[PDB]
Design an enzyme around this catalytic site. Structure first.
Site, short mmCIF file in Angstrom:
data_model
loop_
_atom_site.label_atom_id
_atom_site.label_comp_id
_atom_site.label_asym_id
_atom_site.label_seq_id
_atom_site.Cartn_x
_atom_site.Cartn_y
_atom_site.Cartn_z
N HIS A 128 30.31 14.30 -59.45
CA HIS A 128 31.33 13.30 -59.11
C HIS A 128 31.77 13.45 -57.66
O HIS A 128 31.77 14.56 -57.11
CB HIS A 128 32.56 13.39 -60.02
N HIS A 160 33.16 18.59 -68.91
CA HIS A 160 33.63 17.43 -68.16
C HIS A 160 32.44 16.58 -67.69
O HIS A 160 32.47 15.35 -67.79
CB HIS A 160 34.48 17.88 -66.98
N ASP A 213 34.53 13.43 -56.05
CA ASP A 213 35.66 14.28 -55.65
C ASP A 213 35.21 15.72 -55.36
O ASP A 213 35.99 16.55 -54.85
CB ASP A 213 36.83 14.20 -56.64
N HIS A 250 30.35 19.83 -59.22
CA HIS A 250 29.71 18.85 -60.11
C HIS A 250 29.42 17.58 -59.33
O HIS A 250 29.80 17.47 -58.17
CB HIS A 250 30.55 18.60 -61.39
O1 LIG Z 1 38.16 15.02 -63.91
C1 LIG Z 1 39.02 14.13 -64.06
O2 LIG Z 1 39.82 14.19 -65.02
C2 LIG Z 1 39.13 12.98 -63.08
C3 LIG Z 1 40.37 12.35 -62.92
C4 LIG Z 1 40.50 11.29 -62.01
C5 LIG Z 1 39.40 10.86 -61.25
C6 LIG Z 1 38.16 11.50 -61.41
N1 LIG Z 1 37.00 11.10 -60.69
C7 LIG Z 1 37.24 10.99 -59.23
C8 LIG Z 1 35.89 10.89 -58.54
C9 LIG Z 1 35.17 9.61 -58.98
O3 LIG Z 1 33.85 9.66 -58.43
C10 LIG Z 1 35.09 9.52 -60.51
C11 LIG Z 1 36.41 9.84 -61.21
C12 LIG Z 1 38.04 12.55 -62.31
C13 LIG Z 1 36.69 13.19 -62.47
O4 LIG Z 1 35.97 12.74 -63.40
O5 LIG Z 1 36.32 14.13 -61.71
ZN LIG Z 2 34.44 14.66 -62.41
ZN LIG Z 3 37.46 15.56 -60.83
#
Ligand SMILES: O=C(O)c1cccc(N2CCC(O)CC2)c1C(=O)O
Ligand SMILES: [Zn+2]
Ligand SMILES: [Zn+2]
Length: 217
Positions: A76, A136, A78, A74
């Site tokens: 984001h 998500h 991460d 996806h």
């Molecule tokens: O997916 C999640 O629950 C989550 C938790 C903590 C940080 C997260 N992200 C980390 C990457 C950053 O770009 C946005 C928040 C996520 C996500 O939405 O993938």
């Molecule tokens: Zn995410």
């Molecule tokens: Zn994530």
């Protein structure tokens, strides 16, 4: 911050774990995969950063593997954090059309190659990509490994809480999660982005959490 972690999950399958402090979340762990085919390697999600993507690639190249590509589950960071550095090193990068569009809108560098629709083979009969619908994020996809029966659910698999809802489609998530449960109920191992490896039960738990999250809104 804890170091990049790389663990043998199964034969030809590794979990990589990177870490980044995120406001209102603290130190966030993120799991992805490295999948080995012959003497070739495929990244399933990049780590948060270029440095860790370089660190990860180096670890496998140093073992005699060629990095044939990376797929991002996806938009984001991460999942996509490492795309820039990979592109700069001419390693082929993959993501869905939706994912590429959202990266563009977000002012982020896109993957070189894209795809669309429901089912996609990254490597025929070895690495399948499936888009269950929004959850998500609008674009979230899963990665299926047929030989070992391993599913990488990414940030869509949320067995104990939905996490970051900033770009979530709470309306669609239960339907998306139902379609994912139907198709992949036969999975031996399910790999979430932000919690530990579980069995097929994680699919059911994700559905319950999606349903519960909708009721609450
Ligand atoms: O997916 C999640 O629950 C989550 C938790 C903590 C940080 C997260 N992200 C980390 C990457 C950053 O770009 C946005 C928040 C996520 C996500 O939405 O993938
Ligand atoms: Zn995410
Ligand atoms: Zn994530």
């Amino acid at each position: 911050l804890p170091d990049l972690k790389i663990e043998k999950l199964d034969e030809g399958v590794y979990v990589h774990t990177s870490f980044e402090e995120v406001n209102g979340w603290g130190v966030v762990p993120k799991h992805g995969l490295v999948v080995l085919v012959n003497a070739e390697a495929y990244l399933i999600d990049t780590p948060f950063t270029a440095k860790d993507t370089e660190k990860l690639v180096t670890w496998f190249v140093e073992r005699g593997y060629k990095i044939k590509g990376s797929i991002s589950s996806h938009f984001h960071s991460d999942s996509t954090g490492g795309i820039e550095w990979l592109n700069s090193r001419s390693i082929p990068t993959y993501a869905s059309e939706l994912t590429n569009e959202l990266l563009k809108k977000d002012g982020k560098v896109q993957a070189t190659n894209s795809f669309s629709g429901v089912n996609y083979w990254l490597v025929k009969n070895k690495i399948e990509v499936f888009y269950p619908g929004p959850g998500h994020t609008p674009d979230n996809v899963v990665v299926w490994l047929p030989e070992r029966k391993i599913l990488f659910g990414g940030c869509f698999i949320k067995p104990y809480g939905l996490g970051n809802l900033g770009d979530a489609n709470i309306e669609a998530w239960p339907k998306s999660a139902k379609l994912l449960k139907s198709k992949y109920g036969k999975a031996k191992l399910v790999v979430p982005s932000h919690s530990e490896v579980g069995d097929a039960s994680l699919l059911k738990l994700t559905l319950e959490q999606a349903v519960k999250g909708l009721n609450e809104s």
